[PDB]
Amino acid sequence: LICAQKFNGLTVLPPLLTDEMIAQYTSALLAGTITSGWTFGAGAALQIPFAMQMAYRFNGIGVTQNVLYENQKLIANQFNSAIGKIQDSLSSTASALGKLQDVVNQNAQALNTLVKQLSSNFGAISSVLNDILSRLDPPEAEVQIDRLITGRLQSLQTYVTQQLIRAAEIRASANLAATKMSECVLGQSKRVDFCGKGYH
Amino acid sequence: AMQMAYRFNGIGVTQNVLYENQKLIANQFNSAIGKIQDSLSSTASALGKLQDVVNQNAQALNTLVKQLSSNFGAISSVLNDILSRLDPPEAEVQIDRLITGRLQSLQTYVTQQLIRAAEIRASANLAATKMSECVLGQSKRVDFCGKGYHLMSFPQSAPHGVVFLHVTYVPAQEKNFTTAPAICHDGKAHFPREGVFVSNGTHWFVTQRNFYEPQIITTDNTFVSGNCDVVIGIVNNTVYDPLQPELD
Amino acid sequence: GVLTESNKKFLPFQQFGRDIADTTDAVRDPQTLEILDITPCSFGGVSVITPGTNTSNQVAVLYQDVNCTEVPVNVFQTRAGCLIGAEHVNNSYECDIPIGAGICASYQTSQSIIAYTMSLGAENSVAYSNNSIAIPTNFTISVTTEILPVSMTKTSVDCTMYICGDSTECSNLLLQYGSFCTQLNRALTGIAVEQDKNTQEVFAQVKQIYKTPPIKDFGGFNFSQILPDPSKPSKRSFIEDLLFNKVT
Amino acid sequence: SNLLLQYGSFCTQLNRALTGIAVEQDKNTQEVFAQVKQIYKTPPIKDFGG
Incomplete structure (x- = not known):
């Protein structure tokens, strides 16, 4: 499939940032968040205990600090259980990655259609340039070769336009993801239903 | 000065911090404006987003013009040649080849312009949002109007674009302390009203959270929340009371 | 192609073989009756990494996907192809020129072109402790800068003057496609009015036109760099003039 | 190839568009994840309040 497409000029460049580097970026973000609150997205990380950070955050939704310190074990248990449920929801046949999967499926279908377009006559006597070239004289073979050229160029135009539109959509979604990363992770938000469902 | 004090009180830092540090803040502001003027008046451009627009438009137009000299299959790319060099019933096919080619060119250019215009529309909506939220008011969305806690913003024009100068607040030099959640005074546990407990040793x-300015723990900076046997990390200390000295 | 030894079990009536994309990837030898595979040799594009002609005139070639054995003639096989003309070091700096798959290249010590593995940043651990807090003591005002494009150049095309010229038979032929020019002109006019609305809604957010006082007593802050100067023929401030001369 | 040279600037346009898309994808990843200049490690002690 991959090389089957590769054998017709189609290439696939590798990303500049390998997956280990992205994993290190997320690890850095998560460690900074759990060790320094939100003070590392606005300067230098200022360490602070975690219970006191969670109390700074409880105080941010109009609930006094004295409800965390007196209910710390319960909140710890609820958070651990919620993480466990997240695991049990992802570690099963519950396939909820539709956004990341439709992208791969759409790109694979686009490439499959583009490479399958190479097997149509478009009016010419064949679909292989070598055949027409080897069983027809040039001054006559020009018309067949030109029909094939126009067909293939039209199909390539269509592919490029579809890719442009998909790239615009992905750019919009990536701007949204960057905004969520910058406003939900590196600081507590107060926009309703932007960083969850409930008081963030 | 009072507007700046409002904008500080907006990001947590009290007013006295500004009112007792006005000359230093003014000097830092002027120095930053000078740094901006210098950073712009140099071979370092940083105006790539306003130059790529012009470059892409010029390139699209130049490609559309240059494609007026391609045969597309005809015997020449000059309609007057096709006309004077042939009779109509045979020049029909050549002129039709040229017409199909030029239709294709115009259509491709128009589609790419539509897509570029959608992108510029998205960018202009983002810029309108930033002008409405950062300029006309202080913002609290993190890293939306700069890098740090946002103080204000000044807009400037630019050919086919806009340029925002975001004035933000950044804490600079920190110091370590040994904090604590509460303080058990007489069985009661005194949680801090609007700051954090610290100790020089x-x-x-009790201080604020963004600018070290320590005070004495009275019964106005703290509030009690019951007995002191449930908080995890409380420490013994004496919470001063300002009433008893004067009344007695 | 590359005729290698097969591994597929043809039934004794079949001649060709095909992939999931309908092209021959196997053949039966018409003399010895043996099955062979076919792999093409169309192998990747070529990139050239250059540190700029202003700095130096040596370059490093990168073959995007080859096993470094099929190149014609300091070869280094990376994950993004084959790099010819650059030494691989074991250090790690910021990325100056991107190669792909976490590989970058820079002009550096005489001097040459090096191809390291990029680094993410200065690693530092935080001194987290269950009773240790870091409070700031002094601050810093910072004036950043953010550029945003708002609108591109408005354009318009007259088809029958671009497609055709001062020829009437060409227009009589273009009549066979009646609505294409009208579609195109409608699209371009929509784009133009969209750009005008973009500028209008980005900038025109004030009802009145306010005026700065003649006496500038702002508590120390100096806005004389961003406020307009009446001396200039136009009413652009110093920073706006510094911007309108850097974009061609 | 000689017959295709009669359509002068279509292939260059397509190559330009596709390389633009590629560099835009790299820009997307860089703008989403790379929002910290440092690399914070977590201490080997795990007393995160519970």
């Missing part, structure tokens, strides 16, 4: 103080 011997005594305890």
